[PDB]
Amino acid sequence: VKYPELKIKLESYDSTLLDLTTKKIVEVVKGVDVKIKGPLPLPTKKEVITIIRSPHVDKASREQFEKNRHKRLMILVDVNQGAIDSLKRIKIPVGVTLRFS
Amino acid sequence: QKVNSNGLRFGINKNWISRWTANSHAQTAKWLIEDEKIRNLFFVNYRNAQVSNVEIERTQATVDVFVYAAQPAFLIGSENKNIQKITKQIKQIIGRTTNLDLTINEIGSPMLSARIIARDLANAIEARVPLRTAMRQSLIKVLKAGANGIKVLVSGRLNGAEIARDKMYIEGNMPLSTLRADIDYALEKAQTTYGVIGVKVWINRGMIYTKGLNR
Amino acid sequence: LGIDIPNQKRIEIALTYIFGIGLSRSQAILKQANINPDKRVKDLTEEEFVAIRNVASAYKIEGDLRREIALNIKHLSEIGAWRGLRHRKNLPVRGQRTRTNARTRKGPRKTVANKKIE
Amino acid sequence: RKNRAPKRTVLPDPVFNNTLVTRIINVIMEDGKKGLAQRILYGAFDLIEQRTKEKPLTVFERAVGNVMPRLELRVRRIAGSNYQVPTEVPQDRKIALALRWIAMFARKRHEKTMLEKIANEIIDASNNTGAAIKKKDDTHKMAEANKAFAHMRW
Amino acid sequence: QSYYGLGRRKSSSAKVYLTPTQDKGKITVNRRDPSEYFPNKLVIQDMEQPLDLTDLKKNFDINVVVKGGGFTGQAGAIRLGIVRALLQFNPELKKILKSKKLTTRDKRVKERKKFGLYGARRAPQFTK
Amino acid sequence: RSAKKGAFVDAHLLKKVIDMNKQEKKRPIKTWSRRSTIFPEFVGNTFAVHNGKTFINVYVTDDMVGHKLGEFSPTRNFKQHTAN
Amino acid sequence: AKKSLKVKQTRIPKFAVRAYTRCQRCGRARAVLSHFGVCRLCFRELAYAGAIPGVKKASW
């Protein structure tokens, strides 16, 4: 082993893409590695930005966009160093940004 | 006054055009203002390539610009003389430490993309072609390709003053009100000799039932 | 120097009626001179008044605050100073808007006719 | 125009067992705070047991019965110098207006503290004095004076 | 014999536990009394009005934990949890609980503050 | 108030005023920094402070201590309201 | 006088408080978003274009 508690945390601005990535990781880790509790939903940090529509005053009609940022979490009980060797080839997409322990 | 038909379905029926992230608001602004420059360079400098759109993909000092153009060879050039040139402007506008690895791929049935058709409208109008017959030829050639209804309208100086003489064209089912519609939208500025001509094209490209989410 | 301290009320705020004693230093003197709250002005032993007078004399003389305010005003006015210049015209000095507001010091109102709109 | 509007329901208070008491506590409420008006009204209740020892429910219903107005006034004009028209109003709005009069007249008096002024208001309403019965009597006296208009109206 | 439930009125959750005990029920909410937690109003009376149309605190313990909202939302959540708990204890209570409209999650919640409107409904003012 | 070396000057105006004060104390010297406060040494000279158009002279006196240099120079005129 | 404002905004300022925020593409010195370095109307046009990675329509 020599590396217990691989606490990988994945965060993205999309849900179905992050769900696909976590499904792929849970299926690939379902091989050599064991004792991996399932995906951990997180409160999906959210913000709203509001912008006036017209180039001129027209204040009474303004719209607003929203940059959603979904969040999940994984914990790995032990490395099983061959498992990280298999892990080296995952090539996750750019939309999901990783953060391990 | 109505909303841009692209934005309403964008992010829930259409995948984003530039997927990337960086350190929180430190230089994400820099990356956006940089890759929009690449996008503008593609849509501006090379009219002859009819680039439909560009995909920007950055992750921590790497970039890959997928392109979809009707005619790839003009971007490629003769014996690859133009690809190296265009990639060196991309480099000098992006820096030097970042790999580029551009790719160019022809787009199947390009004539169903509003971008290239609007560009053709701009080229025709700027060339003093009578606007009505150009509209009709472009409309027929687009519709014959097997698509659904079209909406092309043009404002600006229609060969003279009193611009409130604007022509609009609608030729079938194109439901803005339906979110699950798979509609395309574009816009070009046909810089005529008398001012600015804005051409707008709406393309209905079939039903998008059972999509679930973005592609 | 006992200036109109009425009865049927507590001494803590009775001390305030002289010119220059807010409630803050009123409670300060209240605690300094062992005076106990919830005791009306009436039924007050003579012993506390002398201590109150002494501690007040230790502080700034209540009638002399007007003296000092006038002294500061004339001291800043005698030198040509924009703050004094503004203070003379009975208009606020602390930078408040003068376009329409700041009428608590200029007087109630003096209306004047505007343009002949037509 | 519009159609008929359904009414939201009001639940009786299961301690004194009267929904009219609930409408009391609702109307006398300000700022949207049931607690403060609740304490005020219950202190008024305790005062009802305190002086003039009698069932608070009985004096309550007596006040309601005395303050209630028999007829209402409705405006139907033709030209300048408009003319009133007295029409019939159902009991729900009658008791609503009685409660409104009690509430408004209570906060119009001497005896600054709310407890005693509202208690005196309910006492006077039970005893038929000029506090609120005067207003009801006046509004009744304008009625049936021009009842010719009431008979032929729409 | 524990009996369960759940209430979610106005952003306020409420988990309940009910057991038929020796006493009248020994009301205990959040391990403390309702009298000092909830000010003595009709709000404390609201929880036993489900019981009034039933065996009114004959033998039914109260073990409730509360989170979220203010106190009125807490009261609604715990009331709905109680009515669900009686329904779980006895199906025969649907006809009398639903007739009085005690269940069904009134779902009256503060709306979203719409732009251009001060409190999502008030316009600033009108001027000509 | 600065609360730490409260008497504040642009720190470039010190050298010339100190020089002149030890150089027979010439009165007319052109200054633009309405930013500065006066040290106790300042008393004695005149300065052609700039308001925004031209230079107006101010004579410093020991009568006042601590007040800002530029406050002596009004910048905005009076009402001068016409009838209508 | 706009292009000179462009070049002045870029230069290193003599003072920490001298400089201010501004959109890169255009010189509108108002309503610029520090989280995107892009003007509010510029942000709207690029978001309808969709260059920003995460943009939706608010339903919230």
Add this chain to the structure above:
RNA sequence: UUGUCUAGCGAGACUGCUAAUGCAAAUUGGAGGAAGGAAGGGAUGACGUCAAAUCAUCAUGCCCCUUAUGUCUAGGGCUGCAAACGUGCUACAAUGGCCAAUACAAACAGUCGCCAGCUUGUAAAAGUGAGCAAAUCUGUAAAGUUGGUCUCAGUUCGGAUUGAGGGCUGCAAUUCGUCCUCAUGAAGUCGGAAUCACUAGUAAUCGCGAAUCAGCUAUGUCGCGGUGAAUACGUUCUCG
């Protein structure tokens, strides 16, 4: 005194069934049910009108300037002042003033920042110094309850104005910032013709968060939750 909870999927509600009346859409009633007859809300706004607004986002033809209407720099002015209007805030007091104990959110944000706890400081704050890239750590909810004082009056309401002493950012606070403490306490005891908002978790009202930004009497704006109403009989008039 645990399955709350969060976020993914699925179910659920589709006039589904029954009653009536109608050709049929459909209408109403009932049962079931969390919700029943467009469930609450948002996003979404046709052809066009007002030569509506924006050449000062941007692009933009034409015209004009060019050792200047262009470039940099210091100061000022965008904050004035006889006056009037508009939108807000505090109120004009015992439903309240003040003091002590006192518990109850949600959402959002934060490693040049949030700032825990501690020390000094009547205080603005200053210092020490963790934890926190964050459901962990931090950003004390206020209303509310209990107790007490106040006892109806230009006041123990009200806070302007003004004077002084402190604090913070910032090179720097006089035009031209802001906070704290001390000092005084304008006027106002509900307001003329006339008007505005609102059909429920709404009004009112209590607070809380964010943005631009080092600083900002933003009382503004954009958002979150706490407490928490009346009435719609009816369309004769009024507005469109």
Add this chain to the structure above:
RNA sequence: GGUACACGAAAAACCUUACCUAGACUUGACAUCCUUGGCAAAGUUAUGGAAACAUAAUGCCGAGUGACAGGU
């Protein structure tokens, strides 16, 4: 006018800033093309100045040339 008046502006002590006064500058603060190259670019410290700045020195950048650049 409704559809303007806590509006542009989601923040003017300097900048912002577009105005005024004053100081200074002119293929220019900034861009390309023509010709010619390869080491300084910024920032730092004296110096007069209020500061642009002229200085003297440390550590992609230059020099001559018109279309012109530029105009809130």
